[PDB]
């Protein structure tokens, strides 16, 4: 299986230069695609060594950077764009899909706030139709901006079939123990999860060893597509499993959790997890739905040799429905203020719909 | 299975071959398709020695009951496997070649319902009983995919490290031994293919099975919505009669009560065999680790 | 030196002798509501997983030989639920010989000893907070609290804490293991005596109306709590009675009395 | 359990700046907040370290000392900038109150001389509101000067649960044995204080290892709840236990006292104590009340090895009403010498009452 990586708009190209350059460290790979002498497996990311990426002014600063050997603002002008490029964009994919042994996926990374917006939500439609059976996992990132950033949340909805990182928790955290005050700063902080939330598909692990293995285990209905992540360490198994649920830590500016994901990548003891899930679930830190058994997975991995005990948390938290109405709310702010102009209430009425899906997921009928 | 990514492989392209029956499955042409995953996984980087010994074998239904791997030893390391634990790891293999087929059907679900709301979402008479659908499904994947981590942690991580631990210290081969074969005596214990535990394997071979059951009625109520989400889409299309049509679609609806009870009644045995279960394993301590992980946030126990 | 026993006893004072109440104030927080059920209705695999993890949060988390610990259910308390708790210590061959079971129940008898004490003034206390927004039950507060206090002070810092320094020093002058055999029987057949453990029986019944006072200020009447004084005041007559005829034994009326009060 | 603390106006984090540089310290912490090589339980102010802190012109001075890496005049006037932050300042104590485990208190660190005066007032009261079960122990430090100096003083007694530093004493003891005759120079002396004051908070100790086990042993009724502090050394235990009665060291400006703290922070004979307990019940040099049974406390503590015999003294004594008196006093004078000004009169009032209550505390017949 393999999995080909997009990347759109600014935001994209960068986040995505620096998940290559963190992971062409991790493995024996020299800048210049050549292996290094100096077990891991790279043939899902790498094709036999070169990137499967598809990159789409930004791009002359990849160019003239070290690593060249590896290869408007309307959100309508960027929807715009993307259908007169139609043919063209489609047939560097197709080759790059054909081509492929047995594709499995489409990693997306770009930002909802001006043209991988747009032009983002355009491929998300276009790559389902054209695909009914590829996973489309999105690193999508959260900041006419409130237009711009529901309107993709209509296409989030229904197109993708499963990770939110917003700057806001990405700026608090920057000032508070890294002191920065900058794209350049923060960036390190999110290639860092990347580079470590696929950390189960590079290495031959004992489960989840497919994409769709740590999809399908955390998102129990397609509505309810949107995760966040948790990463401590910037010692026993106790210690990273506390200071994960700890707010301070999770990424995200009643309510409980439905399925989490713990990955610890260090050489920690193999007896003492079951331990710790044990004092879990006596002090009682987190809380579940009430619905249906919901259970917390954890996972170990093996850090590369040519590149300390860390630590990763995926889980899927109904309190993401709150960063909803804060775009929900700006809208309508926005609609009093100033062809149809109704592709924009259909927007707004399908994510009122998630909204009230996860509000509903929360009670102890959600079913119907 | 430690490998995972291998095995990943390996099960996609046999899918096409074991669904057949036995009566037509020779080992000959089965050696082709291992070989290609050995090759396109991460394994081909491996020692060509042991990868000489690695083949199949044909147990003597249908071909997800007569697959098993091999890797036959010959020898002065014939003197540590010793026709014993190749009869054990064997009898250890079916229970992790059952409990990863059981696995990847439920992904494959799961995959269906991520495409089958992306199609008829504009039919709201069947999202009603759409959703008994997938409750019953994330009902599901959450007993085969906590119960896929104490094999991983409890059983192999775990008594896998008492053994590397005893022989790097150990010497004179007779310590090698004695720490190899009681590594296949926990292995056996911590899993439920004891002799005494024989009431609890039996009890989880029902909770396998409905997770076929599940698998084909549901395709029957997947396929049943698009043949006439098919012929909704022709009879207007072509168009742009209208009497004859509203009884097709009026009994249409009038037969979604009757897929209704099926899920009704499904779900209401699947819980009736799980809860059951659980009552069964309190008894044999290491096995306390897996009415945790199953009960978690104590959703049955009421 | 190897498998040392000065450095393991210290392991011991942690936990039996309560030396450490940042491990107590963290567990006892913890597994509280889970404590006042009655016995067979908790489940064990419960408490043992508070208790591992009331360890590692607090600041016994520096110590090699925490792995220890082990929840031992009493059937008989110190003659429930709450009242049937005690923790329990395993030792391999070597060590065994000076901490055996004979020596350890022992320490096993001035733990409950020192747990039901310190159990009654972590309430007794807790209602100080509840009454903080009739007006003659803090007057009674002020007397019970004031005793139970008085006995823990003269429980560590007189009769514990410098019995331990003895034995501290009474095995640096060692010559045999017959001699550190007699050296800790000698520490522990000292502290019962200097202690009510070995009769004294007054002293349950004494902190007996104290749980129930704090009982009926928990329900928040004003003809009960001056019934609780004729009793509680006549139970304390008696100890300072009985704790006057001896020949230490007779430092703790200066321990419960300061001001001359109770000459009566 | 954990306890944050407040620091408000010039007094407070000044004082309070130097409180976290004799713990950061006393403890293996460099000021970069990293555990330097070189048992001591640090849970309960740092946070895995940071310090617990929140502090509220001079936040400039702090931020350009190397310890950077570790984070009008009218009363009315106080008060009234709090009532328009209030929502901004109480967000980043909510965060820091839920992030925590299991909070515990409130320590404030306050001057009641000119905004300190009014917003420390203004916090006391929402506190107790917001939270009813959380212990607020307020260091206060006694110096238009009267009216704002008994204001703070209807407020701290019925708002805070539980310690006064005035800084005449600091001056006599400063001239007297320091010869500096300066603001950095007596704070040394205050922060010497409050290092010892927590003391069994910091150490696993037999008893007092919870702040409701100081406060509720010498407090014996809630409007009784101003105590002091006393400090030799500027030997056994009875040298140190005699010198910390005598008044040359007392820092405060019949009379008999209510209960006795000492805190013995050295490596003396644990024997001895009763001994010299015994000698003082001889030699009589302690009067207490004669209505309820009052005794004297001593506990042992650990210095830490990373950073001699020491002691401190923490006692209720009912002399504490002198020092009121002398506030109440200058006010009566100010009032006849110069929208409803009806405040006042009511803290006049209610200050009144604990002048009563004192005074009627060393009688044989206080109750009722």
Chains 1, 4 share one sequence.
């Not at chain 1, 508070?176 to 189960?200: E, G, P």
């Not at chain 2, 009566?23 to 020695?49: C, K, M």
């Not at chain 2, 989880?204 to 989400?229: H, M, S, T």
Request: proline share 3%; hydrophobic share 40%.
């Amino acid at each position: 299986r393999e999995i080909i990586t997009l990347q759109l708009g600014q935001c994209g190209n960068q986040i995505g230069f620096e998940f290559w350059k963190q992971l062409c460290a991790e493995h024996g790979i020299s800048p210049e695609g050549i292996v290094e002498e100096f077990t891991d497996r790279k043939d899902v990311f790498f094709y036999q060594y070169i990137p499967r990426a598809v990159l789409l002014r930004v791009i002359h600063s990849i160019l003239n950077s070290p690593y060249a050997k590896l290869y408007g603002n309307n959100w309508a002008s960027g929807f715009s764009q993307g259908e007169k490029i139609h043919e063209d964009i489609f047939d560097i994919i197709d080759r790059e899909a054909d081509g492929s042994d047995s594709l499995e996926g489409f990693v997306l990374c770009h930002s909802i706030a001006g043209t991988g917006s747009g032009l983002g939500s355009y491929l998300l439609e276009r790559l389902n139709d054209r695909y009914p059976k590829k996973l489309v996992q999105t690193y999508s990132v959260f900041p006419v901006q409130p237009y711009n950033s529901l309107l993709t949340l209509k296409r989030l909805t229904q197109n993708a079939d499963c990770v939110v990182l917003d700057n806001t928790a990405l700026n608090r955290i920057a000032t508070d123990r890294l002191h920065i005050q900058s794209f350049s700063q923060i960036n390190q902080l999110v290639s860092t999860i990347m580079s470590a939330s696929t950390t189960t598909l590079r290495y031959p692990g004992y489960m989840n060893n497919d994409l769709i293995g740590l999809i399908a285990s955390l998102i129990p209905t397609p509505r309810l597509h949107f995760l966040m992540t948790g990463y401590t360490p910037l010692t026993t198994v106790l210690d990273v499993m506390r200071r994960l649920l700890q707010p301070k830590n999770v990424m995200v500016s009643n309510h409980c959790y439905i399925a989490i994901l713990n990955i610890i990548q260090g050489e920690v003891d193999p007896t003492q997890v079951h331990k710790s899930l044990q004092r879990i679930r006596e002090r009682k830190l987190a809380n579940f739905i009430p619905w249906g058994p919901a259970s917390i997975q954890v996972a170990l991995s093996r850090k590369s040799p040519y590149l300390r005990v860390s630590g990763l948390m995926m889980a899927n938290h109904t309190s993401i429905s709150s960063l909803f109405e804060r775009t929900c709310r700006q809208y309508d702010k926005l609609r009093k203020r100033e062809d149809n102009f109704d592709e924009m209430d259909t927007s707004r009425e399908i994510v009122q719909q998630l909204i009230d899906e996860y509000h509903a997921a929360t009670r102890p009928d959600y079913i119907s | 299975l430690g490998q995972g990514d291998f095995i990943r492989h390996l099960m996609d392209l046999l899918k096409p071959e074991l669904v057949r029956p036995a009566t037509t499955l020779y080992q000959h042409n089965l050696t082709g398709i291992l070989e290609t995953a050995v090759r396109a996984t991460n394994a081909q980087f491996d020692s060509p020695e042991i990868l000489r010994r690695l083949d199949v074998r044909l147990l003597e239904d249908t071909g997800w009951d007569v697959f098993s791997l091999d890797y036959h030893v010959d020898g002065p390391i014939a003197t540590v496997f010793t026709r014993e634990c190749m009869s054990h790891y064997l009898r250890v293999f079916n229970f992790l070649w059952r409990a990863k087929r059981m696995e990847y059907i439920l992904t494959d679900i799961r995959k269906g319902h991520m495409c089958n709301a992306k199609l008829l979402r504009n039919m709201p008479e069947f999202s009603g009983v759409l959703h008994q659908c997938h409750i019953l499904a994330s009902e599901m994947v959450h007993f085969i995919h906590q119960m896929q981590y104490y094999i991983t942690f409890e059983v192999l991580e775990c008594s896998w490290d008492e053994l590397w631990n005893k022989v790097q210290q150990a010497q004179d081969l007779d310590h090698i031994i004695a720490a190899h074969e009681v590594f296949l005596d926990t292995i056996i214990s911590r899993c439920l293919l004891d002799s005494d535990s024989r009431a609890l394997l039996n009890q989880l071979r029902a909770v396998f099975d409905q997770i076929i059951e599940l698998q084909n009625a549901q395709d029957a109520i997947y396929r049943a919505a698009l043949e006439e989400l098919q012929r909704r889409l022709q009879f207007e299309e072509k168009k742009k009669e209208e009497e004859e049509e509203n009884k097709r679609i009026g009994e249409f609806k009038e037969s979604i009560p009757k897929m209704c009870s099926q899920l009704r009644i499904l779900t209401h045995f699947y819980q009736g065999i799980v809860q059951q279960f659980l009552v069964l394993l309190t008894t044999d301590e290491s096995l306390r680790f897996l009415s945790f992980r199953l009960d978690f946030n104590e959703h049955y126990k009421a | 030196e190897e498998k040392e026993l000065v450095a393991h006893l210290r392991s011991i004072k942690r936990y039996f002798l309560m030396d450490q109440g940042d491990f107590f104030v963290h567990f006892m927080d913890l597994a509280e509501e889970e404590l006042r059920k009655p016995v067979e209705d908790i489940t064990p695999p419960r408490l043992e997983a508070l208790l591992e993890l009331a360890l590692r949060m607090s600041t016994a988390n520096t110590d090699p030989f925490k792995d220890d610990l082990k929840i031992d259910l009493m059937p008989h308390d110190l003659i429930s639920g709450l009242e049937a708790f005690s923790f329990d210590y395993i030792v391999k061959w070597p060590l065994s010989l000076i901490i055996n079971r004979k020596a350890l129940t022992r320490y096993q008898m001035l733990f409950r000893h020192m747990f039901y004490c310190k159990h009654v003034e972590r309430q007794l206390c807790s209602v100080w907070i509840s009454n903080k927004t009739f007006a003659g039950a803090f007057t009674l507060r002020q007397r019970m609290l004031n005793f139970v206090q008085n006995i823990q002070y003269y429980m560590m810092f007189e009769v514990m804490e410098p019995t331990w320094h003895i034995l501290e020093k009474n095995l640096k002058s060692a010559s045999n293991i017959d001699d550190v055999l007699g050296h800790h029987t000698g520490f522990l057949d000292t502290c019962l005596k200097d202690c009510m453990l070995t009769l004294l029986k007054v002293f349950s019944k004494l902190m007996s109306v104290c749980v129930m006072f704090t009982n009926c200020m928990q329900k928040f009447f004003e003809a009960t709590i001056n019934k609780f004084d004729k009793n509680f005041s006549a139970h304390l007559l008696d100890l300072l009675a009985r704790l006057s005829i001896y020949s230490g034994m007779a430092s703790v009326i200066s321990r419960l009395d300061f001001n001359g009060f109770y000459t009566e």
